Coordinates of C-alpha atoms and ligand atoms in Angstrom, one line a residue:
Chain A
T189 CA 0.0 0.0 0.0
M190 CA 1.5 3.4 -1.0
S191 CA 2.4 6.0 1.7
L192 CA 1.0 9.6 1.5
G193 CA 3.8 11.1 3.7
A194 CA 5.2 11.3 7.2
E195 CA 2.5 11.7 9.9
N196 CA 2.8 15.0 11.9
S197 CA 0.8 16.9 14.6
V198 CA 1.5 20.6 14.5
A199 CA 2.2 21.9 18.1
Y200 CA -0.7 24.4 18.1
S201 CA -1.9 26.2 21.2
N202 CA -3.7 29.5 21.8
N203 CA -0.5 31.4 22.9
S204 CA 2.4 29.6 21.0
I205 CA 4.1 30.9 17.7
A206 CA 7.1 29.5 15.8
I207 CA 9.4 32.1 14.1
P208 CA 12.2 31.1 11.7
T209 CA 15.7 32.3 12.8
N210 CA 17.5 31.5 9.4
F211 CA 16.8 30.8 5.7
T212 CA 18.0 29.0 2.6
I213 CA 17.9 30.3 -1.0
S214 CA 16.5 27.5 -3.1
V215 CA 16.9 27.2 -7.0
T216 CA 14.2 25.0 -8.5
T217 CA 13.8 23.6 -12.1
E218 CA 10.5 23.7 -14.0
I219 CA 10.1 22.4 -17.6
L220 CA 7.3 23.0 -20.2
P221 CA 6.9 21.9 -23.8
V222 CA 6.2 24.8 -26.2
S223 CA 6.0 23.3 -29.8
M224 CA 5.4 20.2 -31.8
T225 CA 7.4 18.9 -34.8
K226 CA 5.9 20.8 -37.8
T227 CA 4.6 18.3 -40.4
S228 CA 3.0 18.2 -43.9
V229 CA 1.4 15.2 -45.6
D230 CA 0.7 15.0 -49.4
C231 CA -2.5 12.9 -49.2
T232 CA -2.4 12.1 -53.0
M233 CA 1.1 10.7 -52.6
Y234 CA 0.3 8.8 -49.3
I235 CA -3.0 7.4 -50.6
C236 CA -2.3 6.8 -54.4
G237 CA 1.5 6.4 -54.5
Chain B
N268 CA -19.2 -6.7 -22.8
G269 CA -15.6 -6.4 -24.1
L270 CA -15.6 -3.1 -22.1
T271 CA -13.9 -2.6 -18.7
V272 CA -13.8 0.1 -16.0
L273 CA -10.6 0.4 -14.0
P274 CA -10.1 1.6 -10.4
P275 CA -8.4 5.0 -9.6
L276 CA -4.8 4.9 -8.1
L277 CA -6.0 6.8 -5.0
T278 CA -9.1 5.5 -3.1
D279 CA -11.6 7.8 -1.5
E280 CA -10.0 7.1 2.0
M281 CA -6.6 8.4 0.6
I282 CA -8.3 11.5 -0.9
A283 CA -10.0 12.1 2.5
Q284 CA -6.5 12.0 4.2
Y285 CA -5.2 14.6 1.8
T286 CA -8.2 17.0 2.4
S287 CA -7.7 16.4 6.1
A288 CA -3.9 17.2 5.9
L289 CA -4.5 20.4 3.9
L290 CA -7.3 21.5 6.3
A291 CA -5.3 20.7 9.5
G292 CA -2.2 22.5 8.2
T293 CA -4.4 25.6 7.2
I294 CA -6.1 25.8 10.6
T295 CA -2.9 25.4 12.7
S296 CA -0.2 27.2 10.6
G297 CA -1.6 29.7 8.0
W298 CA 0.1 29.7 4.6
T299 CA 3.4 28.6 6.2
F300 CA 3.0 24.9 5.5
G301 CA 3.1 25.7 1.7
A302 CA 6.1 28.0 1.9
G303 CA 8.2 25.7 4.2
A304 CA 7.8 23.7 7.4
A305 CA 4.5 24.4 9.2
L306 CA 4.9 27.1 11.8
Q307 CA 2.1 27.2 14.5
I308 CA 0.2 30.4 15.2
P309 CA -3.0 31.0 17.3
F310 CA -6.1 31.1 15.0
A311 CA -7.2 34.6 16.1
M312 CA -3.8 35.9 15.1
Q313 CA -3.8 34.0 11.8
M314 CA -7.2 35.8 11.1
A315 CA -5.6 39.1 12.1
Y316 CA -3.0 38.5 9.3
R317 CA -5.8 37.5 6.8
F318 CA -7.6 40.8 7.7
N319 CA -4.5 42.9 7.4
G320 CA -3.9 41.4 3.9
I321 CA -7.3 42.9 2.6
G322 CA -6.4 46.4 4.0
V323 CA -8.6 46.2 7.2
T324 CA -6.5 47.2 10.2
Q325 CA -6.0 44.3 12.5
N326 CA -7.5 45.8 15.7
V327 CA -10.8 45.5 13.9
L328 CA -10.6 41.7 14.3
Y329 CA -9.8 41.6 18.0
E330 CA -12.4 44.3 18.9
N331 CA -15.1 42.2 17.0
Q332 CA -13.8 38.6 17.5
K333 CA -17.1 37.2 19.0
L334 CA -19.2 38.7 16.2
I335 CA -16.8 37.5 13.5
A336 CA -16.7 33.9 15.0
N337 CA -20.6 33.8 15.2
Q338 CA -20.9 35.0 11.5
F339 CA -18.4 32.3 10.5
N340 CA -20.1 29.5 12.5
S341 CA -23.6 30.5 11.1
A342 CA -22.3 30.8 7.5
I343 CA -20.8 27.2 7.8
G344 CA -24.1 26.0 9.2
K345 CA -26.1 27.2 6.1
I346 CA -23.8 25.1 3.8
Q347 CA -25.2 21.9 5.4
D348 CA -28.8 23.0 4.6
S349 CA -27.9 24.3 1.1
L350 CA -26.4 20.9 0.2
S351 CA -29.1 18.9 2.0
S352 CA -32.0 20.6 0.3
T353 CA -31.3 19.9 -3.4
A354 CA -29.0 17.8 -5.7
Chain C
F16 CA 3.1 29.5 -9.2
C17 CA 6.8 30.4 -9.6
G18 CA 8.3 27.5 -7.6
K19 CA 7.8 26.4 -3.9
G20 CA 8.7 28.8 -1.1
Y21 CA 8.5 32.6 -1.5
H22 CA 9.4 33.8 -5.0
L23 CA 12.5 36.0 -5.6
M24 CA 13.1 35.7 -9.4
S25 CA 13.6 33.2 -12.2
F26 CA 15.9 32.7 -15.3
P27 CA 14.8 31.2 -18.6
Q28 CA 16.9 28.6 -20.4
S29 CA 16.1 27.1 -23.8
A30 CA 15.6 23.4 -24.4
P31 CA 14.6 21.4 -27.6
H32 CA 10.8 21.7 -28.2
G33 CA 10.4 23.7 -24.9
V34 CA 11.6 26.0 -22.1
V35 CA 13.1 25.6 -18.6
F36 CA 12.8 28.1 -15.7
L37 CA 15.3 28.2 -12.8
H38 CA 13.1 29.6 -10.0
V39 CA 15.1 31.3 -7.2
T40 CA 13.1 31.3 -3.9
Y41 CA 13.5 32.1 -0.2
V42 CA 12.7 29.2 2.2
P43 CA 12.6 30.0 6.0
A44 CA 14.5 27.6 8.3
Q45 CA 15.6 26.9 12.0
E46 CA 12.4 28.0 13.7
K47 CA 12.0 28.3 17.5
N48 CA 8.9 28.3 19.7
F49 CA 7.9 31.5 21.5
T50 CA 5.0 32.7 23.7
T51 CA 2.9 35.3 21.9
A52 CA 0.1 37.8 22.5
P53 CA -2.4 39.7 20.2
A54 CA -2.0 43.1 22.0
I55 CA -0.3 44.8 25.0
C56 CA -1.8 46.8 27.9
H57 CA 0.3 49.9 28.8
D58 CA -1.5 52.8 30.7
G59 CA -5.0 51.2 30.4
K60 CA -4.8 51.2 26.6
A61 CA -4.2 48.4 24.0
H62 CA -1.2 48.6 21.8
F63 CA -0.9 46.5 18.5
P64 CA 2.2 46.0 16.3
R65 CA 2.5 48.3 13.2
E66 CA 4.1 45.3 11.4
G67 CA 5.3 42.0 12.8
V68 CA 4.2 40.2 16.0
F69 CA 4.7 40.4 19.8
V70 CA 6.8 37.5 21.2
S71 CA 8.5 36.5 24.5
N72 CA 11.5 34.4 25.3
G73 CA 9.8 33.8 28.7
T74 CA 11.0 36.9 30.6
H75 CA 11.0 39.8 28.1
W76 CA 8.5 41.0 25.4
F77 CA 9.7 42.0 22.0
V78 CA 8.2 42.9 18.6
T79 CA 9.7 41.2 15.5
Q80 CA 9.1 40.9 11.7
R81 CA 7.2 37.6 11.1
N82 CA 9.4 35.9 8.5
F83 CA 12.8 36.2 10.3
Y84 CA 13.6 36.5 14.0
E85 CA 14.9 40.1 14.7
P86 CA 13.5 41.2 18.2
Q87 CA 13.1 44.9 19.0
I88 CA 12.2 46.8 22.2
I89 CA 8.5 47.5 22.1
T90 CA 7.9 51.3 21.6
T91 CA 5.2 53.9 20.7
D92 CA 6.6 54.0 17.1
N93 CA 6.8 50.1 16.7
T94 CA 3.1 50.0 17.8
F95 CA -0.3 51.8 17.4
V96 CA -3.2 52.2 20.0
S97 CA -6.8 51.2 19.7
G98 CA -9.2 51.5 22.7
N99 CA -9.1 50.3 26.4
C100 CA -7.6 47.0 27.7
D101 CA -11.0 45.3 28.5
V102 CA -12.2 44.2 25.0
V103 CA -9.2 42.2 23.6
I104 CA -9.1 38.4 24.3
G105 CA -5.6 37.4 25.4
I106 CA -4.0 40.9 25.9
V107 CA -0.9 40.9 28.2
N108 CA 0.6 43.5 30.6
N109 CA 4.0 45.1 29.7
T110 CA 5.7 48.5 29.5
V111 CA 5.8 50.2 26.0
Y112 CA 8.8 52.5 25.8
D113 CA 8.5 56.2 24.7
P114 CA 11.6 57.6 22.8
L115 CA 10.8 61.2 23.9
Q116 CA 10.9 60.2 27.7
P117 CA 14.7 60.8 28.3
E118 CA 14.5 64.0 26.1
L119 CA 12.1 65.3 28.8
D120 CA 15.3 65.6 30.9
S121 CA 15.9 68.9 28.9
Chain D
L71 CA 5.1 67.0 19.9
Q72 CA 4.0 70.6 20.7
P73 CA 2.0 69.9 23.9
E74 CA 4.8 67.5 25.2
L75 CA 7.5 70.2 24.6
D76 CA 5.2 72.6 26.6
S77 CA 6.5 70.7 29.7
Ligands
LIG503 C1 15.2 37.3 27.2 O1 15.9 38.3 26.4 C2 16.6 39.3 27.3 C3 17.5 40.2 26.4 O2 18.3 39.4 25.6 C4 17.5 38.7 28.3 O3 17.8 39.7 29.3 C5 19.3 39.9 29.5 O4 19.7 38.8 30.4 C6 21.2 38.8 30.7 C7 21.5 37.6 31.6 O5 21.2 36.4 30.9 C8 21.5 40.1 31.4 O6 22.9 40.2 31.6 C9 21.0 41.3 30.6 O7 21.3 42.6 31.3 C10 19.5 41.2 30.2 N1 19.1 42.3 29.4 C11 18.0 43.1 29.6 C12 17.7 44.1 28.6 O8 17.3 42.9 30.6 C13 16.7 37.6 29.1 O9 17.7 36.9 30.0 C14 16.1 36.6 28.1 N2 15.4 35.5 28.9 C15 15.4 34.2 28.5 C16 14.6 33.3 29.4 O10 16.1 33.8 27.6
LIG504 C1 -3.0 43.7 34.1 O1 -2.7 44.8 35.1 C2 -3.9 45.3 35.7 C3 -3.5 46.4 36.7 O2 -2.7 47.3 36.0 C4 -4.7 44.2 36.4 O3 -6.0 44.7 36.9 C5 -6.3 44.5 38.3 O4 -6.6 43.1 38.5 C6 -7.0 42.8 39.9 C7 -7.2 41.3 40.1 O5 -6.0 40.6 39.7 C8 -8.3 43.6 40.2 O6 -8.7 43.4 41.6 C9 -8.1 45.1 40.0 O7 -9.4 45.8 40.3 C10 -7.6 45.4 38.6 N1 -7.3 46.8 38.5 C11 -7.7 47.6 37.5 C12 -7.2 49.0 37.5 O8 -8.4 47.1 36.6 C13 -5.0 43.0 35.5 O9 -5.6 41.9 36.2 C14 -3.7 42.5 34.8 N2 -3.9 41.4 33.9 C15 -3.4 40.2 33.9 C16 -3.7 39.3 32.8 O10 -2.6 39.9 34.8
NAG505 C1 22.1 29.8 8.6 O1 22.2 28.7 7.7 C2 23.6 28.5 7.0 C3 23.5 27.3 6.1 O2 22.4 27.4 5.2 C4 24.6 28.4 8.1 O3 26.0 28.4 7.5 C5 24.6 29.7 9.0 O4 25.6 29.6 10.0 C6 23.2 29.7 9.7 N1 23.2 30.9 10.6 C7 22.6 30.8 11.8 C8 22.6 32.1 12.6 O5 22.0 29.8 12.2
NAG506 C1 7.8 23.5 20.2 O1 7.3 23.0 21.5 C2 6.6 21.7 21.5 C3 6.2 21.4 22.9 O2 5.6 22.6 23.5 C4 7.5 20.7 20.9 O3 6.8 19.4 20.7 C5 8.0 21.1 19.5 O4 8.9 20.1 19.0 C6 8.7 22.4 19.5 N1 9.0 22.8 18.1 C7 10.2 23.4 17.8 C8 10.3 23.8 16.3 O5 11.1 23.6 18.6
NAG507 C1 -5.4 29.6 26.5 O1 -5.6 28.2 27.0 C2 -5.4 28.0 28.4 C3 -5.6 26.5 28.7 O2 -4.8 25.8 27.8 C4 -6.4 28.9 29.2 O3 -6.1 28.8 30.6 C5 -6.2 30.4 28.8 O4 -7.2 31.2 29.5 C6 -6.4 30.6 27.2 N1 -6.1 31.9 26.9 C7 -6.6 32.5 25.8 C8 -6.2 33.9 25.4 O5 -7.4 31.9 25.1

């Protein structure tokens, strides 16, 4: 059976806050296709040879 | 028939654990569980940030917190009736 | 939209039949727990932070920006007033310092 | 400032 992720209970209470004391710059890749292979078909040459 | 219907990869019980995790993060930690590790904050102060983000000064929340909570609880209640009444 | 974390910038690079984005982002790290309050009572009046949040290390109260720990002494120009102490749920009692106070030694 | 510097 697949696992969705680590279980966690956030330490919430009516007077507690967590503030970060440091940081990391993170560089992330994202990839998108933009164009197909341009094609032309001569249907008389394909059909009738 | 020759025709077949296939199960989804995620079952409804797995979808319900994701909607639970999103909701439990949102209630306990604001947007921070999207931007990094979840950081806890009290829900009245999370709503003070949500108010300050729409240009309403945050003292307006604390000075009206009971009214705002009652309007929210009432508005949630109407969703049950609105879904129960018609398909 | 432009990569996980808070977005700083991105750079395009070409690829065959497509494009690649290098998204540069700020991710917060090394958090600590603090006690917090929505407002502070000074002379019978409620002070709220102009930006950031009130926090305590257990003995002192500070105001800090909310995305990086940088504690400041709480003052009349870090904060703004609205109304009497009695309305706000969870208000706490602390001094708010006035920068003009020692200048009154003139 | 003006009422405070009246002191
Ligand atoms: C909360 O922060 C304040 C300021 O950093 C701490 O107060 C200082 O404590 C040291 C001894 O540890 C004294 O020498 C300084 O004179 C104090 N400064 C002031 C402005 O009072 C305080 O100790 C911290 N408390 C905790 C529990 O960490
Ligand atoms: C914050 O400080 C005020 C006084 O500056 C406290 O108010 C007094 O509280 C006692 C009971 O603890 C009452 O008998 C007095 O009548 C109150 N005085 C005034 C002027 O209202 C207040 O309780 C403190 N708040 C907290 C959370 O400790
Ligand atoms: C912040 O993180 C970097 C590593 O990302 C570390 O070298 C640096 O010492 C840290 N600073 C503090 C104050 O924790
Ligand atoms: C914050 O405090 C709680 C206990 O009050 C603890 O379980 C939790 O691990 C702490 N979190 C951090 C980031 O120190
Ligand atoms: C916060 O919760 C504690 C019990 O956990 C309660 O004694 C206190 O009055 C509450 N304070 C606020 C501001 O809700």
